[PDB]
Design a protein around this ligand. Structure first.
Ligand SMILES: CCCCCCCC/C=C\CCCCCCCC(=O)O[C@H](COC(=O)CCCCCCCCCCCCCCC)COP(=O)(O)OCCN
Ligand SMILES: CCCCCCCC/C=C\CCCCCCCC(=O)O[C@H](COC(=O)CCCCCCCCCCCCCCC)COP(=O)(O)OCCN
Ligand SMILES: CCCCCCCC/C=C\CCCCCCCC(=O)O[C@H](COC(=O)CCCCCCCCCCCCCCC)COP(=O)(O)OCCN
Ligand SMILES: CCCCCCCC/C=C\CCCCCCCC(=O)O[C@H](COC(=O)CCCCCCCCCCCCCCC)COP(=O)(O)OCCN
Ligand SMILES: CCCCCCCC/C=C\CCCCCCCC(=O)O[C@H](COC(=O)CCCCCCCCCCCCCCC)COP(=O)(O)OCCN
Ligand SMILES: CCCCCCCC/C=C\CCCCCCCC(=O)O[C@H](COC(=O)CCCCCCCCCCCCCCC)COP(=O)(O)OCCN
Ligand SMILES: *[C@@H]1O[C@H](CO)[C@@H](O[C@@H]2O[C@H](CO)[C@@H](O[C@@H]3O[C@H](CO)[C@@H](O)[C@H](O)[C@@H]3O)[C@H](O)[C@H]2NC(C)=O)[C@H](O)[C@H]1NC(C)=O
Ligand SMILES: COCC(CCO[C@H]1CC[C@@]2(C)C(=CC[C@H]3[C@@H]4C[C@@H]5O[C@]6(CC[C@@H](C)CO6)[C@@H](C)[C@@H]5[C@@]4(C)CC[C@@H]32)C1)COC
Ligand SMILES: *[C@@H]1O[C@H](CO)[C@@H](O[C@@H]2O[C@H](CO)[C@@H](O)[C@H](O)[C@H]2NC(C)=O)[C@H](O)[C@H]1NC(C)=O
Ligand SMILES: *[C@@H]1O[C@H](CO)[C@@H](O)[C@H](O)[C@H]1NC(C)=O
Ligand SMILES: *[C@@H]1O[C@H](CO)[C@@H](O)[C@H](O)[C@H]1NC(C)=O
Lengths: 173, 1138
């Protein structure tokens, strides 16, 4: 169904990057119609400038300043229900580092009344120029080779313990 | 004297034939609602015959004094009670409320007096109840202890609903309003919610508040102990229990599954096999007690014609040429299907005329061959002659198209294989007894089902039609009512199949809770006791270079060694427990994902480096002749194809993603390792050569009902729906396929199909498997009835008499087949026990030392240990505890401690809580004051006896359950943790059963049977575990429909060990299978994007779902039936070893 996954925080300069904003409704059976609103703070003081407004169908209204042509919608397409509002940056620069917020503005449709809600998800990304891989993809790759090598030495110690045991018991007979 | 004359009429055997025709014509006039006014005299003529029988019996037995001796024979009490109450009706009714008509139904019990032999059966059906007294005390003690626990745990939880928040008699008129509750589409109860992070959550804009009406009609809740007695009685009998399972877990949360695992085991499965083993011990003693008493034109050239035809008949290769010609007829009918070309259709018209022409020409030669005098004497030739006649009657019509059950009677030629195949000969002998030697015990069964159809009709049938609108929102009658005769028969037939709770709610709503609990529980107790007896009766009459070698020697001692085996058994379980984490939440958690990707390469190195260590140690030929070592070799070889091709080449497409789903079989390595799983597997494998005899009959015998279904129902399940309002049109405007198809241009209209239908012999087999296990059978029956023709829109009750197709299959393909199946196993397990070196099956060698040391504990009894101390002050205390009236004091104080628990209720009073807290507080004081006056008086012997050890813990813990009530106020919220500590004062009640010897033997058998039953339970769990991982990888992303909600799903492993637990009781798998079966739009969507995953799509896979569920219904049926044999064969052994 719908799983809320957090976004990645390390971006690579010159490459592309995708910022996940997954907002799942509590009962997946209920109708809704949503839109959204992305705000972005630099490493500057305290501003949060609106950068886009994905309202509905394939129209996406954006472009105040600083980047036109390098932001693409990669969320839900042709639904109006939404539930996935992931932006996608082509050709990351060093001025895309900072703090992002997606504002989901749902409007639930019930059998007699309309109920307007709002969610905010906060995303903090970093532009580097050399992708550090992980920290659990270093420690677990070490611990695989450590466990494999220690388990063979647990055999070959025991294999040569018993091989010296049997030939010495042949000496006694 | 006229008295000497009336004896000659009484004994005269034509008079007993005249009372027989009197009743059987009265039983037709009871069998009709709204009789015409031809009946007023006919009601009196029957009274004219029964009163003459009473005069002819009093005048025959003697004088006016004899009217006492006429009433000495207690079957005459019912003959006299008939004519008295009829006369009251005649005089007039003091109160004409008209439930006195059902006393006239007591005339149908005069058949027990008339028909010879039916009196001695009712005198034995009542005799097998006498032995049932001990079990009935225990099975009502245990429904009442479990009802206390259930009440305590879920009191008030079922009323929780999901209420919104107000747009500004304020509060209580906002709660009461049904516009503020949340209803799912097409449902008439409100959605049920939970406070926890575990139970169900309401949508945004709603709040899970406790106030409401309750589920169903309010007959489901757990408050008021009398309702928690019924809510847990539909768990013992397992009627629709998976709705009461999915309502307490939606309220109280999924962690309350532990309640139902104990009740489905300890209540619904152990207590049923005490009722099944005590009727069988009482039958098989009453059966044995009778055999003890039984022992103590050219006529001379026409003989040239006759003699040469008799040479063809006697010699073989025509008898072998007929039994081949039967099997090619039944394999020619089976290849009929619905979307079928007229060219393929005219093959099967021509091909079945030919096969009729063989068996007619073969039949008329036999009339010429011997003579028509000797030919009709032996049995099979009479059977052949009816089929040849019926197949020519059906051919000879050639005009009527509303009579096509007659082309399904040529299917019965498959029983001519009975003489060759000696297991199909047994299944004819089982059917043959119930018309023959046990044919009076089927008469009784038939009579009883006739009576409860009539009693139920006259009590409840007039009120279904006047109180319609309390049941159905259409204000038409429902599917299952009692307003007619045939429908009240179909209710009584459904109760014996086991589904009694759901047509009871309609009745209670319609008439009242007093009568509907009284009739529908007297059907079920009396009727299942006669069905059970018939079943038992059928069984009991069924059976009557020098250093290379040193190196190898050295390795061998590693593999045999005890640490190396304990090391790998620990690595099987981590490899298995690592499969549980592969749910849809694995894109969300990144740390456990990269751990299990690198741990997966550690484990396939251990299970290679122990394979190669085992080739060297054992041998290359001692390895490949093991067939357990084969089973480990295939699993490792799969994990190399997936590991090498992960690196390079053909990497992720097609047959490598398909080898990824075979990763679910890694738990099968554990089956070789545990000694308990091997003793069970070696015994279930010892039963396969005899099981495959029976399973070939059930495939053969259900293929007749499958082809009979395709002849009747193929093509007749399609129907046209208004897509927006979502109900099907009436016949008045859209009767045809070619008239729904001219309404496709408005886009409001769709021509669809029932999912599980009869378009093939394959799909017949899956429609017959839902009717046979009684889950899913209602949608099939509701549409089989409605059906009209090949492309025609159904109508609501055209074709009403079909239900008998499903009635005939359940008696034959289920009851008789079941009987055939059980009788094979018991004669299998007796010869596998006599023959086997191990005396007892299903126990290991280490357990039989635990077994015999546990049999000694229940056989020892002292009657002089331990005199007491001698003191003046301290020694006067034990003087009264030792007397008999101390225990009688406590045992009656402890049933009043039970009734102070039973009267507790949700939302009772502030004054009532304060009283019961004061009464419960003094029962701590006395039950402690009996403990101190026993412990200090019996200085050392208090801790000695195992009963008194149980007493001493309860005395301590009951005070703990009182002082903690301030500590819970000191702690957090408490619907959750305050309750569970108070469950341990129900442990006071247990000390109550210490007294009954009869019950202390029934518990003992269970204890004795505990080690054997643990060995199969490990196996059942192992197979639940493999199917839970194979469903989690396949059957997530399936569209949320009928049985797949939002809590009970295959999305995770908590969700899918819950779905697979409920199907072990075969319950509710029809709704888990129903959204798997759809693929391709509409009803399913390909390309649905699931957010936060890469797996695009919505659809289920209908070929893998059918293989999933039908494997597990067959496999777990075979496993659970072994657990019935293990319990029942132990109760016999305890009574034998007395
Ligand atoms: C195994 C398959 C057979 C199992 C038993 C099936 C019995 C039910 C068979 C269908 C009976 C329904 C017929 C029926 O409802 O008609 C009603 C008449 O019903 C009958 O014919 C009675 C048939 C069953 C009575 C058998 C005689 C009782 C003998 C007692 C021992 C029982 C032996 C069995 C008339 O009612 P109506 O409202 O005035 O007219 C509307 C109907 N045209
Ligand atoms: C259906 C189950 C009903 C069981 C009825 C058992 C009654 C019974 O057997 O009576 C006597 C049994 O005594 C008892 O145990 C007391 C009867 C209590 C059993 C009822 C227990 C609760 C049943 C609740 C309803 C269940 C349906 C034995 O008769 P007797 O004294 O030995 O006379 C010998 C003359 N030759
Ligand atoms: C055998 C035949 C007799 C056996 C049982 C007859 C029970 C008699 C119940 C008559 C009392 C009916 C009544 O009014 O009590 C009602 C509640 O009492 C009940 O319904 C409890 C009925 C549960 C009976 C459980 C039967 C299981 C017996 C198992 C025996 C096997 C051993 C109160 O009405 P309410 O609270 O306002 O509910 C209305 C909600 N819309
Ligand atoms: C205490 C309530 C008495 C048990 C109520 C019925 C329990 C139940 O449904 O389990 C049934 C076993 O219980 C009984 O046989 C009822 C015996 C009642 C004696 C009083 C399942 O066996 P069956 O279908 O009736 O016979 C085999 C034919 N296929
Ligand atoms: C002369 C006419 C006599 C008519 C007498 C009575 C007919 C009315 C009786 C209605 C049906 C009786 C109920 C019945 O059939 O037995 C019921 C059997 O239900 C079943 O679960 C088994 C149904 C499976 C189909 C039949 C079994 C075939 C077994 C042979 C195949 C073995 C091969 C499979 C393994 C390789 C009793 O159990 P339950 O109540 O359903 O509880 C299940 C809990 N897991
Ligand atoms: C231990 C026993 C282990 C095996 C037990 C059962 C194996 C049943 C496997 C069924 C084969 C599945 C065939 C199948 O899926 O075909 C499906 C259509 O044909 C069918 O419906 C086949 C239905 C077969 C149901 C068989 C049920 C067996 C009942 C026998 C039970 C006997 C004892 C009863 C005891 C409980 C759909 O697949 P498709 O051809 O690809 O259609 C297009 C979909 N895109
Ligand atoms: C599940 O949790 C929620 C929140 O903790 C519980 O909601 C609370 O329910 C009470 C009903 O007892 C609401 O009503 C309040 O009660 C007074 C009683 O006089 C009433 O007069 C007031 O109008 C007041 O609304 C209460 O508002 C509500 N709390 C909140 C924050 O909305 C709910 O009871 C829990 N579910 C269960 C089954 O316990
Ligand atoms: C000949 O000597 C052998 C002797 C014991 C033989 O007596 C047998 C009498 C029938 C009886 C009670 C026996 C074992 C299994 C019992 C069956 C288990 C099945 O379970 C059910 C319920 C669940 C359903 C799925 C179908 O199967 C019942 C219908 C079936 C059952 C209750 C019908 C009756 C059977 C014992 C041993 O002596 C030491
Ligand atoms: C499908 O059903 C329709 C209607 O039942 C058939 O069309 C004809 O409809 C008129 C009036 O609606 C009737 O008077 C005719 O009797 C109908 N024709 C016949 C032959 O009965 C239509 O023929 C049916 N189509 C098929 C393929 O059965
Ligand atoms: C990214 O943008 C720079 C402009 O600063 C441009 O020169 C370069 O070609 C772009 N690279 C890619 C991969 O789009
Ligand atoms: C990135 O943003 C800063 C902010 O002033 C601007 O100076 C710089 O030119 C931007 N980078 C590009 C490539 O335009």
């Amino acid at each position: 169904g719908c799983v809320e996954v957090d976004s990645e925080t390390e971006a690579v300069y010159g490459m592309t990057f995708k910022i996940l904003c997954i907002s799942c409704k509590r009962r997946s059976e209920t109708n809704a119609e949503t839109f959204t609103e992305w705000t972005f703070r630099q490493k500057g003081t305290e501003e949060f400038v609106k950068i886009l407004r994905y309202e509905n169908e394939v129209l996406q209204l954006e472009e105040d300043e600083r980047f036109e042509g390098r932001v693409v919608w990669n969320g839900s397409r042709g639904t109006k229900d939404l539930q996935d509002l992931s932006i996608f940056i082509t050709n990351v620069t060093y001025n895309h580092s900072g703090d992002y917020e997606c504002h989901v503005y749902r409007l639930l449709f019930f059998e007699n009344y309309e109920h307007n809600t709002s969610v905010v998800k906060k995303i903090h990304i970093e532009v580097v120029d050399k992708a550090n891989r992980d920290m659990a993809s270093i420690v677990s790759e070490i611990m695989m080779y450590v466990l494999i090598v220690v388990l063979t030495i647990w055999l070959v110690a025991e294999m040569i313990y018993c091989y010296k045991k049997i030939a010495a018991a042949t000496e006694t007979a | 004297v006229v008295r000497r004359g009336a004896i000659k009429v009484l004994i005269h055997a034509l008079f007993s034939m005249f009372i027989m025709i009197t009743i059987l014509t009265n039983c037709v006039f009871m069998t009709m609602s709204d009789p015409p006014p031809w009946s007023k005299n006919v009601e009196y003529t029957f009274t004219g015959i029964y009163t003459f029988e009473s005069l002819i019996k009093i005048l025959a037995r003697g004088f006016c004094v004899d009217d006492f001796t006429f009433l000495r024979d207690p079957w005459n009490w019912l003959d006299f009670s008939v004519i008295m109450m009829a006369y009251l009706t005649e005089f007039v009714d003091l109160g004409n409320i008209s439930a006195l008509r059902t006393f006239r139904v007591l005339r149908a019990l005069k058949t027990i007096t008339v028909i010879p032999g039916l009196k001695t059966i009712v005198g034995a059906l009542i005799q097998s109840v006498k032995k049932l007294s001990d079990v009935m005390i225990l099975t009502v003690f245990c429904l009442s202890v479990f009802a206390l626990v259930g009440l305590q745990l879920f009191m008030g939880n079922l009323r929780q609903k999901c209420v919104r928040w107000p747009p500004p008699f304020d509060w209580d008129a906002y709660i009461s309003d049904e516009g503020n509750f949340y209803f799912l589409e097409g449902s008439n109860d409100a959605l049920l919610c939970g406070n926890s992070s575990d139970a169900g959550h309401c949508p945004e804009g709603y709040e899970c508040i406790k106030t409401g009406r309750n589920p169903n009609y309010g007959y489901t809740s757990y408050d008021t102990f009398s309702w928690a007695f019924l809510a847990l009685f539909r768990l013992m009998t397992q009627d629709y229990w998976e709705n009461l399972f999915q309502l307490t877990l939606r309220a109280a949360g999924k962690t309350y599954m532990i309640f139902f695992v104990v009740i489905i085991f300890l209540g619904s499965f152990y207590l049923i096999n005490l009722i099944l083993a005590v009727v069988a011990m009482a039958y098989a003693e009453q059966n044995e007690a009778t055999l003890a008493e039984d022992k103590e034109n050219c006529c001379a050239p026409w003989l040239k014609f006759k003699n040469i035809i008799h040479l063809i008949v006697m010699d073989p290769f025509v008898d072998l040429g007929i039994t081949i010609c039967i099997v090619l007829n039944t394999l020619f009918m089976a290849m009929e299907h619905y979307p079928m070309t007229e060219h393929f259709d005219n093959v099967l018209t021509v091909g079945n005329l030919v096969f009729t022409g063989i068996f007619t020409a073969e039949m008329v030669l036999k009339l010429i061959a011997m003579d028509p005098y000797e030919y009709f004497q032996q049995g099979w030739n009479i059977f052949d002659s009816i089929i040849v006649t019926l197949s020519l009657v059906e051919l000879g019509l050639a005009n009527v198209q509303g009579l096509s059950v007659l082309r399904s009677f040529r299917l019965l030629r498959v029983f001519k294989l009975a003489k060759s195949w000696p297991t199909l000969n047994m299944l004819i002998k089982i059917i043959g007894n119930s018309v023959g030697a046990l044919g009076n015990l089927t008469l009784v069964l038939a009579i009883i089902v006739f009576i409860f159809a009539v009693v139920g009709m006259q009590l409840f049938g007039k009120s279904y039609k006047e109180c319609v609108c309390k049941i159905a929102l259409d204000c038409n009658l429902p599917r299952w009512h009692m307003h007619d005769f045939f429908h009240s028969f179909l209710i009584v037939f459904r109760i014996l199949c086991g589904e009694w709770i759901e047509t009871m709610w309609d009745c209670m709503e319609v008439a009242g809770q007093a009568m509907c609990l009284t009739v529908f529980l007297m059907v079920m107790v009396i009727g299942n006791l006669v069905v059970l007896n018939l079943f038992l009766a059928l069984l009991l009459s069924s059976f009557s270079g020098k250093k290379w070698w040193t190196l190898r020697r050295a390795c061998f001692k590693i593999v045999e060694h005890n640490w190396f085996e304990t090391f790998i058994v620990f690595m099987i379980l981590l490899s298995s427990g690592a499969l549980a984490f592969e749910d849809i939440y694995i894109e969300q958690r990144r740390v456990i994902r990269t751990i299990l990707e690198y741990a997966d390469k550690v484990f396939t190195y251990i299970f290679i480096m122990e394979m190669l260590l085992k080739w060297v140690a054992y041998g290359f030929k001692v390895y490949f002749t093991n067939a357990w070592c084969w089973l480990d070799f295939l699993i490792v070889d799969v994990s190399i194809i997936s590991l090498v091709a992960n690196w390079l080449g053909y990497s992720e497409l097609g047959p490598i993603k398909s080898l990824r789903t075979l990763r679910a079989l890694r738990p099968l390595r554990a089956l070789s390792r545990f000694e308990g799983m091997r003793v069970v597997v070696n015994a279930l494998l010892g039963a396969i050569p005899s099981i495959m005899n029976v399973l070939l009959v059930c495939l053969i015998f259900w293929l007749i009902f499958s082809i009979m279904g395709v002849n009747l129902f193929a093509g007749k399940f399609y129907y046209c729906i208004n897509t927006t309002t979502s109900e099907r049109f009436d016949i008045s405007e859209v009767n045809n396929k070619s008239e729904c198809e001219s309404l496709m241009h408005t886009g409001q209209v769709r021509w669809l199909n029932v999912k599980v239908n009869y378009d093939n012999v394959g799909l017949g087999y899956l429609s017959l498997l839902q009717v046979a296990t009684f889950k899913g059978w209602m949608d099939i029956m509701y549409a089989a009835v409605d059906s009209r023709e090949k492309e025609e829109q159904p109508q609501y009750e055209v074709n009403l008499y079909m239900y008998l197709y499903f009635v005939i299959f359940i008696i034959f393909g289920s009851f008789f087949t079941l009987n055939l199946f059980i009788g094979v196993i018991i004669d299998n397990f007796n010869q596998q026990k006599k023959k086997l070196g191990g005396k007892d099956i299903f126990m290991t060698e280490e357990q039989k030392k635990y077994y015999n040391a546990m049999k000694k504990l229940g056989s020892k009894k002292p009657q002089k240990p331990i005199p007491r101390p001698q003191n003046k002050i301290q020694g006067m205390v034990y003087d009264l505890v030792t007397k008999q009236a101390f225990d009688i004091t406590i045992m009656i104080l402890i049933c009043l401690n039970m009734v102070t628990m039973m009267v507790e209720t949700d939302n009772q009073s502030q004054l009532k809580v304060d009283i019961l807290y004061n009464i419960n507080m003094i029962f701590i004081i006395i039950f402690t004051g009996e403990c101190v006056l026993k412990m200090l008086a019996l200085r050392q012997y208090y801790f000695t006896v195992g009963w008194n050890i149980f007493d001493f813990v309860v005395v301590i813990l009951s005070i703990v359950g009182l002082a903690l009530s301030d500590l819970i106020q000191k702690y957090f919220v408490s619907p959750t943790l305050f309750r569970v500590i108070r469950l341990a004062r129900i442990g006071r009640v247990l000390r109550l059963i210490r007294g009954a010897k009869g019950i202390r033997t029934l518990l003992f058998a269970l204890m004795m049977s505990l080690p054997a039953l643990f060995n199969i339970g490990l196996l059942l769990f192992l197979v639940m575990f493999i199917y839970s991982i194979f469903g989690m990888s396949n059957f997530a992303y399936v569209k949320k429909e009928s049985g797949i909600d939002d809590m009970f799903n295959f999305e995770t492993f908590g969700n899918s060990i819950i779905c697979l637990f409920e199907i072990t009781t075969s319950a509710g798998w029809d709704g888990l299978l129903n959204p798997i079966l759809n693929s391709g739009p509409p009803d399913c969507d390909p390309n649905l994007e699931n957010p936060g995953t890469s797996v695009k799509g919505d659809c289920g896979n209908p070929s893998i779902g059918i293989c999933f569920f039908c494997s597990y219904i067959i496999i777990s049926f075979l496993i659970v039936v072994n657990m019935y044999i293990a319990i029942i064969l132990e109760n016999f052994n305890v009574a034998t070893e007395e």
